[PDB]
Each structure stands twice: as structure tokens, then as C-alpha cells.
Design a protein around this ligand. Structure first.
Ligand SMILES: O=C(Nc1cncc2ccccc12)[C@@H]1CN(S(=O)(=O)N2CCC2)Cc2ccc(Cl)cc21
Ligand SMILES: O=C(Nc1cncc2ccccc12)[C@@H]1CN(S(=O)(=O)N2CCC2)Cc2ccc(Cl)cc21
Ligand SMILES: [Cl-]
Ligand SMILES: [Cl-]
Lengths: 302, 298
């Protein structure tokens, strides 16, 4: 019993964190095999950030301009190349702690663990979701750039996020491990802003199924809804539209609890209308949207 | 910016998790140097009588895909100590520490000696933890990290009828009035950790949330008369001293923040949230707030 915001054990990722320094800028890098991956903005100064020409800044650098530190050991850079917004530094030593891994690009609504690092040293681990507006609500200070997001389903680490910047509202933007930003963000100090955020509907439904599995049913009602009527109501509360894919994805949780997806949708419509009236659901007074259907199945009893 | 329920990096603890099997019971063990620590209930009660009937070879200890051989066994309170023939080469610098209610720690939840997740929690004033554990999680441990030293503070033993959890320190002493046996047991009435809510209000101010601030202040005695009414733990002068640094950083005196908390208890949030929460959060200590708002590494 119980339901917590649970992160994957971070050990496999801790053994990959290194510190990267170029001139006066120091940030984090991910050391996998003989390559260190880091945000390309490590080659910029604060002035460069308004309109940096990364190709022009990079051509002026040599291998020995990049200082890479793994623990108390300096790694030697023997090559460098840029792939989108990431810099790939070829080093002379393969990481003996390299786990089994993949690079995966995730969709909004998907969750992952973040190992927040400063100076190549891990400071903490927490759970995050890629918001519908492609930002993440992380906890990052200056020097956190290069910290990564990942999932570890079955001994393989799937790296899905690398931290690059904080937007004016305090939210965070970054790339996949191939250097493609999530959302319309750019690694430039331009007037950029997160778009209007929405609630991840399929995740709230998943969390309501977790509450039923753990023994709470107070929010259920005798009603049902069509998918279209549910979407017309939910969009009025800034909830993402629920698609037939989301309904199919919720099938297993529906079968385990005996509550049809559209019946759980009617319960959500009523919760949006009434609020909780002094009650809680899994220790929360707000509707939680950072647990996916897969996360609920992973954590909850069968 | 941002404020999350953050756990310590778990790698140093992952390298200590092993699977322990005795008969039909399988649970988790903590392998440090040449000893595996696990709940004594793995033997299945008169524990001295049950233990004397077991031999070293009755305990199967598995570290990854390697079987460790047990060469000795002894009991210390509610913890079984299995002497093994191999010292753990991954043994980190460590201590066994007993924590107080209100203190937080990270839990590395394990099944079959394999870590499945990490989360942060607090020892409640009623000595239970609101964890997330299924059958087979027994022997999972709670810890903190200070620089490079792992301080082990909790070992999971059981789930109470309300779904909350009970366990021991690593010397086998229970937190709370619990016993390791199938008998009628219940969590006592819980209270809210006042010093932790105040710490979280300071974290909200640091992150730019100030709507709850007011021009008022209070005395410790008047605030404590309010805390008692709302099932909040009493605030002591030690708590006030501990909050000093956060008070100096934000410019809001501790009794000034106490007046803000009193108004929140008496009037609610009125449709507003604090750090994305509609409830007053009590599972962040003053040190957790300072550490997350400064970026301390391990
Ligand atoms: O965002 C960036 N860094 C950070 C990242 N995360 C969490 C931070 C917290 C606190 C300070 C920095 C943080 C950097 C620096 N900033 S900054 O204007 O100095 N800024 C303060 C809020 C962001 C411009 C910038 C522009 C583009 C790029 Cl790719 C990186 C960056
Ligand atoms: O509590 C224990 N295990 C668990 C521990 N944590 C999370 C569980 C979730 C689900 C099932 C077990 C779980 C065990 C078994 N139970 S039990 O009656 O089978 N029970 C169901 C709720 C607890 C009695 C018992 C008595 C004493 C001792 Cl020390 C351990 C234990
Ligand atoms: Cl995805
Ligand atoms: Cl006994």
C-alpha cells in the first residue's frame, strides 16, 4: 500500500556524470563509452547568448580547450563535434561504468527521473513529466545544465532529456540526447516564454485508477459520458483532449478495477465541477497529473 | 527555480542490496563489509527458538547473479546479522544512525534484492512512515548522505492496517510501539510537523510565492496554543533557532512566519496554492530546504 512520486534508482546514471569546462563556463556532461555529451552553450560567454553562432564559436576551439573531469581524474579530449544543440566530446578513456543504454525521445505527458548535478557531482533525484507545453517543472539552480532525465525499465537506461535552460516563469527547457529541443525553444537568450500549460488528462485518469486500486472510491458516480462530451467539458478546465489512444492505454487499469474508462471520465468531470470538498485522493488535495498509466501499473499492486 | 520532493542519489546504497531467502520467505538484505543485515522475521514467535533450529546453509543470500555463503548468524534486537565469506567491495563509508520524528530520509524500495525505486519520506510524529511498499519489500532501507558518508537510519519490516509502514533502525530497534509479529497493531493519531511546514513556507518565499505573508507577528506561547488546536506538533525554541538561517535570508522572522501559518490554519488557502500544493507540506526539514535551494552535491 501507499503511493509516492517514485524515481528510478540513480546509480547507473551517477557513474556517467562528469564536469565539463570551456573557458569560464562549467557545466555537467554525460560520459558513455568514449564520448562526453553536454549542452553546446558551454562554448558561449554571457554576451554570446543573445545571438551565438555556434559553428563560428566551435571552429575557434581545439580539443585541449575542453577540460573534462570524472571524479578526481582529468579525461583527455581527442575529438569534438556538434549534433544539433549538443556537443559530443570524444575522450581517450571509455567509461568502465557505462551501463546498458539507449537514447529515446519522449512525448508530452511521459514521465522520467532527473538526476540534478553541479560540477559533475549528483546532488539529488526527483520525478518529472514532460508538460504538454514541452517544458518540465524541475528544480535546478545555476550550474545544473547538462543534468539528465531518464527511465530504467529492465536494466537498460533510456536517456530522454538533457537540461539546457530556465524560462522566465521558473520552468525548464532542454533537449533529447541527439540535441533536438523539446518544444519551440532555442539555446539563445531571446525573449522566449512557455506557452499556456494544460493538465495531462490520461495521467489524472491513471492516478484515479491508482486510488481505486489502493481502496478509495468516494469520487465515483453512477454516470457515464461519451468521449466527445468529456473533451468538451475537460477543455473548459484547461485539460488536454483525451484521445482513443489514451482510452486504449487505460484498458488494463479499467480491467483490473472493473471501472470502464468512460465511467472514470464521468468521475473526473464531476471532480472538476465540485472540487474535493475537504477530501483527499492518495494524500493530495489537487488532481495529480505526473503519473502515467505505465507508472501506476509499475508501482501499484496487481 | 523549482522545488521538488528530492531524494539523495541512491547508487551507494544500490551496491549493498542483496536477496535473502530462508525456507519459503524471500526479502531484502543490506550487505556491508562481511555482514548481511535483514529483518529477523525472515526465519518466520520465539525468535531465539526459531533461530537455534537454523544452520548457516539454511540462509540463501544472492548478490546479483552470485550466491554468497553464510558462515555465521546472530540476532541483534529485530535484525538478523548474517556473516558471509565475501566482504562487499562496493561497501561505502557508512554509519548507523537513529533518527527522530520529523526527520526525513530517502528510501530505496527493493524486491528480490533488486532496487526498483527511490523516494523521499519523513518519520511521522506517530513513528510510522507513509511509504510505498508491496509484499517482498521488507529489508528495504532508508538513508541520508553527508558529503560521502551514508547514514543508514531505517529498515522496513511491516505494513499497518491503514496502509502506513513500520520498521527499525539498523541496530534492530523499532521506531514506535510496534512488534514484529502478526497481532493487532495500529498507528496512533498523527500530527503535523510544524517546523517542517515553516521551512516549506520559507522555501515558497525563496521561490517567489509571498501571498500568505502578513504584517503581523506572534509569541511562541500564542502560536503553540494555535498549533495544539490544529493537531500540529508544538514549536520549541530549538525549532526557532534551527529556522534562523532561512529567516535571515528572506527577512521574515520565525514568529512573523508563525503569524502567516496561524492565518493559514484559521482561514485556509482560499483557492490559492503554495509551491503547487493545496495542503501545507510537512515532509521537508529546514536543512532539506537549505540544501535544495543551494545545490549541495555528493
Ligand atoms: O538558463 C540558464 N541557466 C540555468 C538553467 N537552469 C536553472 C537556472 C537557475 C538559475 C540561473 C540559471 C539557470 C542559462 C543562463 N541564463 S540566465 O539568463 O542567466 N538565467 C537566469 C534564469 C535563466 C540565460 C540562458 C539562455 C539560454 C541558455 Cl541555453 C542557457 C541560459
Ligand atoms: O507486513 C508485512 N509485509 C509487508 C510489508 N510492507 C508492505 C506490504 C504490502 C502488502 C503485503 C505485505 C506487506 C508482513 C506480512 N503481514 S500481512 O499480514 O501479510 N500484511 C498485509 C499487510 C501486512 C504480517 C506481518 C506481520 C509482522 C511483520 Cl514484522 C511483517 C508482516
Ligand atoms: Cl513517450
Ligand atoms: Cl521472541
Amino acid at each position: 500500500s501507499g503511493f509516492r512520486k517514485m524515481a528510478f534508482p540513480s546509480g547507473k546514471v551517477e557513474g556517467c556524470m562528469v564536469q565539463v569546462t570551456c573557458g569560464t563556463t562549467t557545466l555537467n556532461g554525460l560520459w558513455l563509452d568514449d564520448v562526453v555529451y553536454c549542452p553546446r552553450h558551454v562554448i558561449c560567454t554571457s554576451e554570446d547568448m543573445l545571438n551565438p553562432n555556434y559553428e563560428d564559436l566551435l571552429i575557434r576551439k581545439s580539443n585541449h580547450n575542453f577540460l573534462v573531469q570524472a571524479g578526481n581524474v582529468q579525461l583527455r579530449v581527442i575529438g569534438h563535434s556538434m549534433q544539433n544543440c549538443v556537443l559530443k566530446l570524444k575522450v581517450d578513456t571509455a567509461n568502465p561504468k557505462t551501463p546498458k543504454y539507449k537514447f529515446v525521445r519522449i512525448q508530452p505527458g511521459q514521465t522520467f527521473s532527473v538526476l540534478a548535478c553541479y560540477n559533475g557531482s549528483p546532488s539529488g533525484v526527483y520525478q518529472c513529466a514532460m508538460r504538454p507545453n514541452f517544458t518540465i517543472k524541475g528544480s535546478f539552480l545555476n550550474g545544473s545544465c547538462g543534468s539528465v532525465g531518464f527511465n530504467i525499465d529492465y536494466d537498460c537506461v533510456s536517456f530522454c532529456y538533457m537540461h539546457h535552460m530556465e524560462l522566465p516563469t521558473g520552468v525548464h527547457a532542454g533537449t533529447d540526447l541527439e540535441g533536438n529541443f523539446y518544444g519551440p525553444f532555442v539555446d539563445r537568450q531571446t525573449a522566449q516564454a512557455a506557452g499556456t500549460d494544460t493538465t495531462i488528462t490520461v495521467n489524472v485518469l491513471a492516478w484515479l485508477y491508482a486510488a481505486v486500486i489502493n481502496g478509495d472510491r468516494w469520487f465515483l458516480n453512477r454516470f457515464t459520458t461519451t468521449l466527445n462530451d468529456f473533451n468538451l467539458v475537460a477543455m473548459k478546465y484547461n485539460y488536454e483532449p483525451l484521445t482513443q489512444d489514451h482510452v486504449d492505454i487505460l484498458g488494463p487499469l479499467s480491467a483490473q478495477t472493473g471501472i470502464a474508462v468512460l465511467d472514470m471520465c464521468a468521475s473526473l468531470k464531476e471532480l472538476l465541477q465540485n472540487g474535493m470538498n475537504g477530501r483527499t485522493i492518495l494524500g493530495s488535495a489537487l488532481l495529480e497529473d505526473e503519473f502515467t498509466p505505465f507508472d501506476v501499473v509499475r508501482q501499484c499492486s496487481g
